[PDB]
Design a protein around this nucleic acid. Structure first.
Ligand code: NA
Ligand code: NA
Length: 327
DNA sequence: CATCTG
DNA sequence: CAGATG
């Protein structure tokens, strides 16, 4: 956690690069189990050889570890942090809509900057465009004080469209968090479930209302169950307009809301322990359901859940306020 | 995993 | 349809 930190960090720089710049998914994955294990390792790694002793740790990595321990640096790491091509890819990738793949294409075409991008707006797709247009707003965190106003609007409009909708704002926002990166709404309706064959309108109507009143400004991607967009809190009395914020809305069959809701609220850590505990308690849990574990190895059958309560209950646990869902 | 692009 | 992005 701090004993093999530099090592784990270097390995991470390395892994990322294989994957983003080179195409090296193997190598890339290589660096990763490595950091994973050295990370778990209980002592202070004093040499390559020592590491090498670990699984995932081979000779090449061992080698690297040596030089890093030998000197506060690594040449290769040093070489890469300079390299403009590598840098460009890390940068372009920052735009919503640009993954490594595209980052490579553009670079090879000479687009390496924001400006490059603007000049070449023709080569970018809709998502990518939006991403470019709101590069700044997109990188800005979302303070809870805004978050509450957003939630305030969303929930109100949903209610108006149908009294039966149930919306929830998951994420860190839900666990306390002073700021967040984006708005995540989980949505369901009684008239939508596991069996029930579809109901796209269910999601389209809300999206539409949100646009009606102007809260939603652009569409990144709109499916029949998942909407990805951009929204904005109406600028008050002109002098201070708000940043453009990322937002997602997803329809869920009512028969698996809370597991979803549970799940999305996190944290990853909370999940895990919760998950692991479930298991002890003779249970299974994933994003959509909780199932009674048979003994034959495994088994299933969705347990019936009416709230996040039913869940804990199941695994016989202490109902946790979202704030304390931390770890 | 769901959506988009080409 | 494969392949990309989130
Ligand atoms: Na990106
Ligand atoms: Na292939």
């Amino acid at each position: 956690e701090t004993l093999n930190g530099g090592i784990t960090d270097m390995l991470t720089e390395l892994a990322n690069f294989e994957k983003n710049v080179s195409q090296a998914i193997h190598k890339y994955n290589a660096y990763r189990k490595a950091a994973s294990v050295i990370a778990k390792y209980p002592h202070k790694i004093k040499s390559g050889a020592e590491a090498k002793k670990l699984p995932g740790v081979g000779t090449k990595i061992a080698e690297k570890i040596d030089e890093f321990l030998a000197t506060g640096k690594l040449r290769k790491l040093e070489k890469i942090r300079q390299d403009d091509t590598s840098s460009s890819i890390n940068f372009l990738t920052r735009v919503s809509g640009i993954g490594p793949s595209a980052a490579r294409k553009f670079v090879d075409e000479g687009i390496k900057t924001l400006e490059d991008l603007r000049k070449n707006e023709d080569k970018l797709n809709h998502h990518q465009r939006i991403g470019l247009k709101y590069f700044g707003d997109f990188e800005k965190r979302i303070p809870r004080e805004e978050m509450l106003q957003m939630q305030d609007i969303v929930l109100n409009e949903v209610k108006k469209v149908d009294s039966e909708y149930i919306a929830t704002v998951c994420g860190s926002f839900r666990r306390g968090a002073e700021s967040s990166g984006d708005m995540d709404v989980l949505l369901t309706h009684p008239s939508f479930t596991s069996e029930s064959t579809k109901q796209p309108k269910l999601l389209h109507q809300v999206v539409e209302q949100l646009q009606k009143v102007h809260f939603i400004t652009d569409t990144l991607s709109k499916g029949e169950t998942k909407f990805m967009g951009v929204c904005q809190l109406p600028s008050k009395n002109d002098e201070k307009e708000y940043p453009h914020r990322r937002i997602d809305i997803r329809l869920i069959p009512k028969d698996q809301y809370y597991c979803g809701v549970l799940y999305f609220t996190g944290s990853d850590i909370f999940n895990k322990n919760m998950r692991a505990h479930a298991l002890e308690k003779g249970f299974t849990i994933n994003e959509y359901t909780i199932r009674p574990l048979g003994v034959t190895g495994v088994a299933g059958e969705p347990l019936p859940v009416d709230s996040e309560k039913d869940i804990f209950d199941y695994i016989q646990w202490k109902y946790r306020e979202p704030k304390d869902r931390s770890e």
